[PDB]
């Protein structure tokens, strides 16, 4: 219902998230996916790496600059999975893809917005315990992505700042909770509680 | 001749219609529409206003009033399908609305008969309204849907 929906991609299964995002974009919702380096794929790391290497060997023989472009970054791997689920060669598909942004980490301005999750795509809710799974950052770094460390350092800095913000918010929440607990005995409090509030 | 005349012509005798078996029986309103109920206008220049339902007219319209002094909605008629009937009611025992009808609202400045009738009806409506708390403020306020409001589940 929001004008823009920001999905924290951490702990999501790539294909189920891609299916959800594709339907939302086609239905007209603006979506920003952050932390694409923390997406999961079910199956062993060696298996998913083998699948990527098969993708890598696919190329146009007489001119490689024409063949499939193998993007290494996690955001681009997710974008590929999504474009496969959109009819991207039509004007409607292009307009749908114009409604999507995908990022590694959480850069500005989304680092101060609310992030949501997609429960039907969450690894902890979908995969059975004991099943091996792959992380997109490791897969990307093994296939040639070169910014894993930079993103990790930036995310550590963001987490430090976010922890400070949350400490201040926790203090203010405690103060407001006390101010409301001192008002639980009033006539307005009794009337509101009778009405359910 | 540019065109040869037809040897046969359709008749110009305008035949009458057959006798129609379609009687006009009185409209049956839904149960929630009883006089005195507060109803929310859904369209018109007064959309979102909360008014009081007085009586059911012969052209199947509903006679409503704000009352005019509470929210600025005069004595009017409205269509029943363009309102929501809420559960709040006010007594209309002391209100005399037997002089209002289609000929009263015939259109064919603002008439003094309508002004004075509005004052007279507003007097008794105000007297009855001042019994339950916050009802005058409720009638002054306008209605709208909020974020997350689901009309199929809202109780009106």
């Amino acid at each position: 219902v929001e004008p823009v929906v920001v999905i924290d991609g951490k702990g999501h299964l790539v294909g189920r998230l891609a299916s959800v995002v594709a339907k939302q974009l086609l239905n007209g919702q603006k979506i920003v996916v952050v932390r694409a380096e923390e997406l999961n794929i079910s199956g062993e790391f060696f298996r998913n790496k083998l699948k990527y290497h098969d993708f890598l060997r696919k190329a146009t023989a007489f001119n490689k600059t024409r063949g499939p472009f193998h993007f290494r970054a996690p955001s681009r791997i997710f974008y590929k999975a999504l474009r496969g689920m959109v009819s991207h060669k039509t004007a409607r598909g292009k307009a749908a893809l114009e409604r999507l942004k995908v990022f590694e980490g959480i850069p500005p301005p989304y680092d101060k917005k609310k992030r949501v999750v997609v429960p039907q795509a969450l690894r902890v809710l979908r995969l059975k315990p004991g099943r091996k799974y792959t992380t997109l950052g490791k897969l990307s770094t093994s296939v040639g992505w070169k910014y894993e460390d930079v993103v990790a350092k930036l995310e550590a800095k963001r987490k430090v700042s976010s922890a400070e913000y949350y400490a201040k918010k926790r203090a203010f929440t405690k103060k407001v909770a006390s101010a409301n607990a001192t008002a639980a005995e009033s006539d307005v409090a009794k009337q509101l509680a009778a009405l359910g509030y | 001749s540019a065109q040869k005349a037809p040897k046969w012509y359709p008749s110009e005798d305008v035949a009458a219609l057959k006798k129609t078996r379609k009687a006009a029986r009185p409209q049956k309103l839904r149960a929630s529409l009883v006089p005195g109920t507060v109803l929310i206008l859904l369209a018109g220049r007064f959309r979102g206003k909360r008014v009081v339902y007085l009586k059911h007219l012969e052209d199947n319209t509903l006679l409503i009033s704000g009352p005019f002094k509470v929210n600025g909605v005069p004595l009017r008629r409205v269509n029943a399908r363009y309102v929501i009937a809420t559960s709040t009611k006010v007594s209309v025992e002391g209100v005399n609305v037997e002089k209002f009808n289609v000929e009263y609202f015939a259109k064919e400045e603002i008439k003094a008969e309508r002004v004075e009738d509005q004052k007279v009806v507003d007097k008794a409506l105000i007297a009855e309204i001042k019994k339950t708390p916050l009802l005058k403020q409720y009638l002054s306020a306008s209605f709208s849907l909020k974020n997350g409001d689901k009309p199929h589940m809202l109780k009106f």
Partner: protein, 126 residues
């Protein structure tokens, strides 16, 4: 003011144009049926042009009627016009293309006197 009629419904307002008349200038749009044994248009494959057929025929009550509800009768002079003297609710007069302006004014005056609708009273008007 014609005789009352049902609302006129046209089943197919679009013109039936010949196959590949758009593609070739030498192929005119006048309808022709394709007669090749392998014609996909003849065999009625999906996504091709529609072809004329009797099912498209219009209701017999509102056939030949103008929107005003009259059938068109071409008149060349006042004697032709006066044939419609009694059938003014069923027939409207259309002046023939080759009538001169000075005869058109006479025909229009006579039609107005007789209460006959004229489909083209603006032809050759000064």
């Amino acid at each position: 003011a014609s005789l009352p009629h049902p609302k006129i419904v046209k089943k197919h307002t679009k013109k039936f144009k010949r196959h590949h008349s758009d593609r070739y200038h030498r192929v005119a749009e006048n309808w022709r049926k394709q007669k090749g044994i392998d014609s996909v248009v003849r065999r009625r494959f999906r996504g091709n042009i529609s072809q004329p057929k009797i099912g498209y025929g219009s209701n017999k009550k509102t056939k030949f009627l103008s929107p005003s509800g009259h059938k068109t009768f071409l008149v060349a002079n006042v004697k032709d016009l006066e044939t419609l003297t009694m059938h003014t609710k069923t027939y409207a007069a259309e002046i023939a293309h080759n009538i001169s302006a000075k005869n058109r004014v006479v025909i229009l005056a006579r039609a107005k006197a007789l209460g006959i609708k004229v489909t083209n009273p603006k032809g050759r008007l000064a």
